[PDB]
Design a binder for this molecule. Structure first.
Ligand SMILES: NC(=O)c1ccc[n+]([C@@H]2O[C@H](COP(=O)([O-])OP(=O)(O)OC[C@H]3O[C@@H](n4cnc5c(N)ncnc54)[C@H](O)[C@@H]3O)[C@@H](O)[C@H]2O)c1
Ligand SMILES: NC(=O)c1ccc[n+]([C@@H]2O[C@H](COP(=O)([O-])OP(=O)(O)OC[C@H]3O[C@@H](n4cnc5c(N)ncnc54)[C@H](O)[C@@H]3O)[C@@H](O)[C@H]2O)c1
Ligand SMILES: O=c1ccn([C@@H]2O[C@H](COP(=O)(O)OP(=O)(O)O)[C@@H](O)[C@H]2O)c(=O)[nH]1
Ligand SMILES: O=c1ccn([C@@H]2O[C@H](COP(=O)(O)OP(=O)(O)O)[C@@H](O)[C@H]2O)c(=O)[nH]1
Ligand code: NA
Ligand code: NA
Lengths: 337, 340
């Protein structure tokens, strides 16, 4: 199988550490029905969370994760809710008092975010602000945000918004409220990602659509990335930007060709780079990143920004005419393509 | 397959009528990536809409319908938006000036809406008010709302919210702004519906979970139900509550049996799990003996009286603040009998 062939198989998965971090906690997962969120949920159960609160605005996704976890229904609360609804969210936090928030709600599709930049701003930046602010006010002990390699030297709106989320959450970290962000790259087989698409095209006797002959991504299984996220959250003291070692880059052409050989004839058609799309995402581990006890996990450097400043910029982002230009002022390494 | 066996095969599908209604229109579909919405989008393309504006708050669903329709990318605009965001929504309508809105955005799962009644109120009732109000202020000519047989003498939160939506939209209808609501029953193969549930249970060698041995639902293929919706919309003059003829009801037990038979796997037992809160054994038959006929044998007009919007807007505000949503709904919808 292709997923097998591309799995990382990190040597440093540590079940008992994550169990030690999660046992008997009240954990809330935002975007609980998403690719990342659903797996966060499954692992929270696996590693012994006492109560899992599942927040998602997509009814099918909340339904699906709730139904998937039906054997543990007595430990789970499905909360059908947008994290933009401050008042309802504050109520959820007051009532359940979670000790840990795993924040996996966002918009992530680069093209749809180039087409809908204001919604990417609201959903990603303003949603993260509201959830993070409400977590801190309601004495949540620890807050872990999912980030992405597309947040590093971002060339798209999506990625730049997640970079602003890193800046915000990490700047809210203090002795009482420990925030960590974790960057990682592509997850194998997430819905509406390149692999099931190729599998479909192959099953429909269609040509495989390849963006560019040279395009490469880094890949991990979802269970691999999520367990490493949780190990990172376990060791965090607050303020860390973590980065996962994704292993070898994979050329998407080679991925196409392996999938063809795997089903024993169709042509691969080149369709062109898309706006804001990178030929090679940034390698996540810098040579000056600090090591942790886990070989797959490093801590990248980050400075706090002034929150009065950053809040004003976030206010302005909601009303401004040129979102791209506003984002550059906040994220100077943003080179918008 | 089961789908074929339970397909309505309505004798009165009219392609040329639908084309005449949609040809060269700017049409906006809310919940564009949903089960019903996505089929609405497809048929807008099929029947010659000039420009389809696809509104949905679920990024994957929006992505998927957009991709599904990539051969028509130049005629579609994917708008990643919640209809609760009035100011972004007003600007969408000011920009694209749709002539028709097909409103297929809602929350529909009865158990989730029992557990999240406030979200059901906000997403369904408040989302419908905002979209409808904005459509009317922006001189959209016609507004069609997707409703449900669960809105008829509702016993659940979800169904009751949809009833309120019917009241609001229909009461908004006037000589400039033509509203139609269309009620129909279950769509075969829908998102999170019983048939995929049974398929996944068989795939993992588990027993089939059947709520109750006597439970029945009415069914239709999604393309049938949606083309009939659009035919209703085409003949609407504003104010009509339409109802579809769903044919013969289906006992879910027979469906479960058939699916077991059809994958040869009668090794599997059928465990009875029990009727859920809010859940009906038998949904209401949609056509009343006094409903009016149309030229389509599968579509009738049910009676409705406008309510006063000053009253209805006041109750809608109360729903957002009240202690007891069930009790507040009952004031708006006298026939609401909440099952716990
Ligand atoms: N999928 C990947 O390969 C991948 C890899 C690395 C990083 N990430 C990052 O992880 C994050 C999550 O992405 P994903 O792949 O799980 O996407 P997803 O769309 O599958 O999941 C996101 C979930 O969040 C929910 N959601 C979105 N906005 C919400 C809101 N305002 N309120 C409540 N719920 C909301 C969605 O309904 C969905 O279920 C993104 O920031 C993405 O960049 C994803
Ligand atoms: N599926 C059925 O069998 C069936 C039958 C009759 C009537 N209906 C009715 O049709 C409506 C939709 O049903 P469905 O089966 O399509 O559900 P769905 O969940 O499959 O589709 C709804 C779509 O609307 C979107 N949405 C929800 N809230 C939104 C918001 N605030 N802004 C933007 N988009 C939003 C969702 O993301 C989704 O893509 C419901 O009112 C339901 O009762 C469904
Ligand atoms: O039809 C496709 C879809 C994707 N890709 C490439 O495969 C990689 C993974 O795409 P995906 O959408 O899976 O995730 P993204 O990195 O886009 O978040 C990227 O280099 C894409 O350009 C491709 O070549 N053909
Ligand atoms: O696991 C299930 C799910 C549903 N049903 C029954 O099958 C019918 C279809 O339910 P569905 O959720 O598909 O849609 P609903 O009628 O609930 O909107 C209903 O009478 C349910 O009680 C069932 O027996 N087992
Ligand atoms: Na261990
Ligand atoms: Na539960």
């Amino acid at each position: 199988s292709i997923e097998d062939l591309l799995a990382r198989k990190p040597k440093d998965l540590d079940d008992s550490a994550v169990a030690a971090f999660l046992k008997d906690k009240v954990v809330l997962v935002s975007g609980a029905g998403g690719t990342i969120g659903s797996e966060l949920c499954k692992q929270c159960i696996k590693f012994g969370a006492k109560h899992l609160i599942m927040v998602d605005h997509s009814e099918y996704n909340l339904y699906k994760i709730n139904d998937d976890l039906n054997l543990y229904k007595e430990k789970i609360t499905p909360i059908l809710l947008s994290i933009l609804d401050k008042q309802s969210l504050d109520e959820v936090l007051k009532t359940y008092k979670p000790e840990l928030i795993l924040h996996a709600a966002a918009y992530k599709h680069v093209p749809l975010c180039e087409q809908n930049p204001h919604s990417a701003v609201i959903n990603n930046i303003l949603g993260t602000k509201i959830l993070c602010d409400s977590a801190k006010e309601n004495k949540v002990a620890k807050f872990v945000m999912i980030s992405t390699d597309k947040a590093v030297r971002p060339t798209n709106i999506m990625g730049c918004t997640k970079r602003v989320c890193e800046l915000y959450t990490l700047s809210m970290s203090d002795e009482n409220f420990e925030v960590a962000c974790v960057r990682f790259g592509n997850v194998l087989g997430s819905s509406g990602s390149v692999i099931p698409k190729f599998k479909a095209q192959i099953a429909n006797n269609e040509p495989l659509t390849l963006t560019h002959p040279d395009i490469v991504r880094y890949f991990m299984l979802v269970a691999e990335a999520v367990q490493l996220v949780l190990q990172a959250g376990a060791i965090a003291k607050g303020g860390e930007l973590f980065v996962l070692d994704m292993g070898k880059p994979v050329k998407i052409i080679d991925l196409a060709k392996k999938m063809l050989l795997l089903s024993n004839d169709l042509e691969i058609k080149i369709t062109g780079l898309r706006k804001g799309e990178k030929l090679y995402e940034e390698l996540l581990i810098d040579e000056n990143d600090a090591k942790t006890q886990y070989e797959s996990i490093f801590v990248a450097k980050n400075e706090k920004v002034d929150l009065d400043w950053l809040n004003k910029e976030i206010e302005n982002l909601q009303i401004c005419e040129d979102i791209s230009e506003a984002l550059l002022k906040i994220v100077p390494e943003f080179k918008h393509n």
